Structure 1
Amino acid sequence: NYEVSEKAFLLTQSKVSIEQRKEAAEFVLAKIKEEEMAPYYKYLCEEYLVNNGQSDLEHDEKSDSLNEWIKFDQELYNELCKKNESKIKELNEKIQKLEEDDEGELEQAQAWINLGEYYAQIGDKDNAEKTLGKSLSKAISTGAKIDVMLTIARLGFFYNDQLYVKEKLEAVNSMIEKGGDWERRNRYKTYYGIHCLAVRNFKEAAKLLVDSLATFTSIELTSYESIATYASVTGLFTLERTDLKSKVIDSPELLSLISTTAALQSISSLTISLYASDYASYFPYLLETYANVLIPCKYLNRHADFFVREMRRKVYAQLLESYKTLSLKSMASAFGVSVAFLDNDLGKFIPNKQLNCVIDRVNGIVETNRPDNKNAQYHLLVKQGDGLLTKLQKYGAAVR
């Protein structure tokens, strides 16, 4: 169901390549008709409310999409309810035979496993979670317990659930003994890496995404090119230049992606320009990547332009350590930067102490400040120490 959530997000807000909305709208209409989900055709009305590039034309004539009618009707709804009532009749016929038999704990749990898949495919969220809790306690081992988490993670990625899904994610991880189990490792590192995306941890995102076991590729939730897509974005923050030439540029998993998928280009244009520290080539590849990567992805476009500010902060630090004193017009004719607009670009960092760059407005030259010292490092202990003493006084006076 990767293309189900992808094409549904493309119809929310798209400021670039409006032609992709046609292939996205025509896909979600043919996918719901071929599936059993009733409400996901109705959710298109509420989910797109107050969004640029509206996909719904009823009272709003400002819709810029190519397919302007997502409107819900009773014609398709009644047809989807017939497939739901016909399938539950076959399952209840088998469950009734299982209740009268009751052979082991696997067949008793399999009755709820078939329901856990049924209630997930008919569009129920809380009703499906109630069915998954019954099969979790009746499981004979950890093999049937992790399949419960797979359905929880399926409904959690569509509705963006950071609480119930994250709690059950670490529950299967801990249990009694973890071990080297492939299911409790490969699946955990990929799903927990997706949860780190939305919260932007960046500490475990580089290790659990840029470094993957082999291909992942379950095809049910996320795909192969998606894991490599976030790897290029998250690999530019925590991973320094030492790991860029090992797990990024020289990574064997990213060598065959260039000749396979050419629509990404985030592992070449961004990596080569940063490794060579050339601002001339690095600038035009920012908007080309921003359009075809950040915007289409669901966990990226929520932030978007903030990443442009953070990615440009990386290249400013690469040049700052390469010189002490430099003229402003030198990088203008070489790296293709505007002198008049350079002060406004660097004005979002230097006063916030994000960069050590110092530009002299008299002669038009840039200098370099001290990158690190003992004084700037003790300031982190001041804010961390004062913030810790608050809990000691708060919890100390609360208990009495």
Structure 2
Amino acid sequence: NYEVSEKAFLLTQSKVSIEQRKEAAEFVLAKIKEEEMAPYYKYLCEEYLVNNGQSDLEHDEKSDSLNEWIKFDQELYNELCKKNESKIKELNEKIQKLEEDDEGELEQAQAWINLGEYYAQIGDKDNAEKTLGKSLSKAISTGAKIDVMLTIARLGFFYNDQLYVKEKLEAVNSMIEKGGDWERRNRYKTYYGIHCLAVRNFKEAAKLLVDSLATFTSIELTSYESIATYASVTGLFTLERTDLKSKVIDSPELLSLISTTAALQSISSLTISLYASDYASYFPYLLETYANVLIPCKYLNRHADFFVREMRRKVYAQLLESYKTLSLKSMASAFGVSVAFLDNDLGKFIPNKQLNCVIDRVNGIVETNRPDNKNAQYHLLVKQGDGLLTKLQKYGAAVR
């Protein structure tokens, strides 16, 4: 189900090539024949508008699109009824006979789950959760628990809903805690780091992603190259260079992951340039990471500017720690940028107290302000010490 949501997401924003939309349309047309995408197929016009979202022959009549395959017709209307009779009408009649004959226990619960998964592809979520809720009481061990969690896990990836999914996934996992192997636990662990990108948790996302394996592929839930970009980009932003040398840049799987596909451009272009402290070619890597990684990915396109703006602030901190002073002529020219471009980035960073530095105008020397023995007891002990005392006085001043 994720293969369609990944390819059709390129239909939303394409600023360069038109063929990217037609190439991604070939994967959509192939999957809609085997499985009915009608809930997401109708969600195409309800997601992003004023591109392809105005083209429909049924609910709303307008023609504006670069893709004519997303509009209903007489063929898809007949196929919608054929898939609805086989996956629901034909299967429910056989399950109804098993209910009266009393055949098995978990077999009827698993049959309701497989039947409930078909309502998700027809576009009716009321009967999908109704048949799933009846089979939830029959779940005891991890045999029927994986299938119940699998249906709710689809709600997050297929319907792109971060609200009612995680609340249900946590309730099912916390009811009976076993986990089976480590891969069945990834469904809760991988979606955890993915949900952190919606509410912008930053370093919290990479907690379970860095320790996760790079060979994990959920197919219909997620692809191989999609999860590879989530752990590479978020893991690089979380762990500092101290932890990058013993984990990211040197790993048995990660070194094998970068050679599989060239669509990462994170653990190779960004990591080596950061480890070698080469700022000449490091700047164009951020543009390739933004265009060819962040934009095509689903959850990596939500932040947008929040990647390059924050990553550029931290890469300067690695340079400020290795020198007391610097050269403004070398930073604003030799690294591939201009003078006005450097003052715009550092202009917003200084008043936010995100770093300690000394910028020179006439002399043109970038000097680092080093606390020496001050460290974390200088401005943090007074701010965090007295700041928490303000929260302590909240309930003590007003009582109840």
For 1:18 and 1:386, locate their aligned partners in 2 and report how far apart those are by CA, in whole Å: 57
Shift of 1:387: 7.1
Q: What does residue range 213-292 of structure 1 map to in structure 2 within 5 Å? A: 213=213, 215-292=215-292
Structure 1 pair 147–87 and aligned structure 2 pair: CA distance change class (3 A): closer
Shift of 1:79: 2.2
Structure 1 pair 263–203 and aligned structure 2 pair: CA distance change class (3 A): closer
Structure 1 pair 222–90 and aligned structure 2 pair: CA distance change class (3 A): same
Contact kept in structure 1, 2:45 and 2:54, CA below 8 Å: no
Decide which moves more: 239-248 or 332-341. Answer: 332-341
Structure 1 pair 114–2 and aligned structure 2 pair: CA distance change class (3 A): closer
Shift of 1:109: 0.9
Shift of 1:23: 0.9
Structure 1 pair 159–327 and aligned structure 2 pair: CA distance change class (3 A): same
Shift of 1:311: 1.2
1:101-151 Cα offsets, whole Å, 9 max, x none, are: 223421331331122221122223343122211111112422211211111
Structure 1 pair 26–181 and aligned structure 2 pair: CA distance change class (3 A): closer
2:150 is paired with a residue of what secondary structure? helix
Structure 1 pair 87–53 and aligned structure 2 pair: CA distance change class (3 A): closer
Shift of 1:260: 1.9
Shift of 1:393: 6.8
1:159-212 Cα offsets, whole Å, 9 max, x none, are: 333332212222233224436643552332222222223223234422311221
Contact kept in structure 2, 1:91 and 1:114, CA below 8 Å: no
Structure 1 pair 60–286 and aligned structure 2 pair: CA distance change class (3 A): farther
1:315 is paired with a residue of what secondary structure? helix
For 1:62 and 1:79, locate their aligned partners in 2 and report how far apart those are by CA, in whole Å: 23
Decide which moves more: 217-226 or 323-332. Answer: 323-332
1:6-50 Cα offsets, whole Å, 9 max, x none, are: 012111122243321111123223322332233332222222215
Structure 1 pair 60–89 and aligned structure 2 pair: CA distance change class (3 A): closer
Contact kept in structure 1, 2:333 and 2:339, CA below 8 Å: no
1:245-285 Cα offsets, whole Å, 9 max, x none, are: 22211111122223321232222111101111211111111
For 2:60 and 2:85, locate their aligned partners in 1 and report how far apart those are by CA, in whole Å: 36
Shift of 1:80: 1.3
Aligned-residue sequence identity (percent) comes to 100
Contact kept in structure 2, 1:57 and 1:69, CA below 8 Å: no
Structure 1 pair 386–327 and aligned structure 2 pair: CA distance change class (3 A): closer
Contact kept in structure 2, 1:294 and 1:304, CA below 8 Å: yes
1:53 is paired with a residue of what secondary structure? coil
Unaligned runs of 5+ in 1: none
Shift of 1:292: 0.7
1:320-343 Cα offsets, whole Å, 9 max, x none, are: 112222231123453233223211
For 1:138 and 1:181, locate their aligned partners in 2 and report how far apart those are by CA, in whole Å: 22
* TM-score, scaled to structure 2: 0.87
Contact kept in structure 2, 1:53 and 1:63, CA below 8 Å: no
Decide which moves more: 330-339 or 302-311. Answer: 330-339
Shift of 1:215: 1.7
For 1:107 and 1:50, locate their aligned partners in 2 and report how far apart those are by CA, in whole Å: 47
Structure 1 pair 77–295 and aligned structure 2 pair: CA distance change class (3 A): same
Decide which moves more: 377-386 or 191-200. Answer: 377-386
Contact kept in structure 2, 1:98 and 1:108, CA below 8 Å: yes
Contact kept in structure 1, 2:153 and 2:187, CA below 8 Å: no
For 1:386 and 1:206, locate their aligned partners in 2 and report how far apart those are by CA, in whole Å: 31
Structure 1 pair 154–381 and aligned structure 2 pair: CA distance change class (3 A): farther
Structure 1 pair 386–210 and aligned structure 2 pair: CA distance change class (3 A): same
For 1:57 and 1:15, locate their aligned partners in 2 and report how far apart those are by CA, in whole Å: 27
For 1:396 and 1:332, locate their aligned partners in 2 and report how far apart those are by CA, in whole Å: 53
Q: What does residue range 151-162 of structure 1 map to in structure 2 within 5 Å? A: 151-162=151-162
Shift of 1:372: 7.3
For 2:276 and 2:58, locate their aligned partners in 1 and report how far apart those are by CA, in whole Å: 52
* TM-score, scaled to structure 1: 0.87
Contact kept in structure 1, 2:40 and 2:159, CA below 8 Å: no
For 2:223 and 2:80, locate their aligned partners in 1 and report how far apart those are by CA, in whole Å: 28
Contact kept in structure 2, 1:8 and 1:28, CA below 8 Å: yes
Decide which moves more: 368-377 or 160-169. Answer: 368-377
Decide which moves more: 312-321 or 293-302. Answer: 312-321
Matched length: 400
1:246 is paired with a residue of what secondary structure? helix
Contact kept in structure 2, 1:146 and 1:172, CA below 8 Å: no
Structure 1 pair 53–146 and aligned structure 2 pair: CA distance change class (3 A): closer
Contact kept in structure 2, 1:36 and 1:80, CA below 8 Å: yes
Task: Could you list the structure 1 runs, at least 4 aligned residues long, displaced by more than 4 angstroms after superposition.
Answer: 50-66, 371-400
Contact kept in structure 2, 1:39 and 1:123, CA below 8 Å: yes
Decide which moves more: 235-244 or 168-177. Answer: 168-177
Structure 1 pair 391–116 and aligned structure 2 pair: CA distance change class (3 A): farther
Contact kept in structure 1, 2:55 and 2:71, CA below 8 Å: no
Shift of 1:390: 7.3
For 2:322 and 2:81, locate their aligned partners in 1 and report how far apart those are by CA, in whole Å: 66
Contact kept in structure 2, 1:198 and 1:299, CA below 8 Å: yes
For 1:56 and 1:306, locate their aligned partners in 2 and report how far apart those are by CA, in whole Å: 35
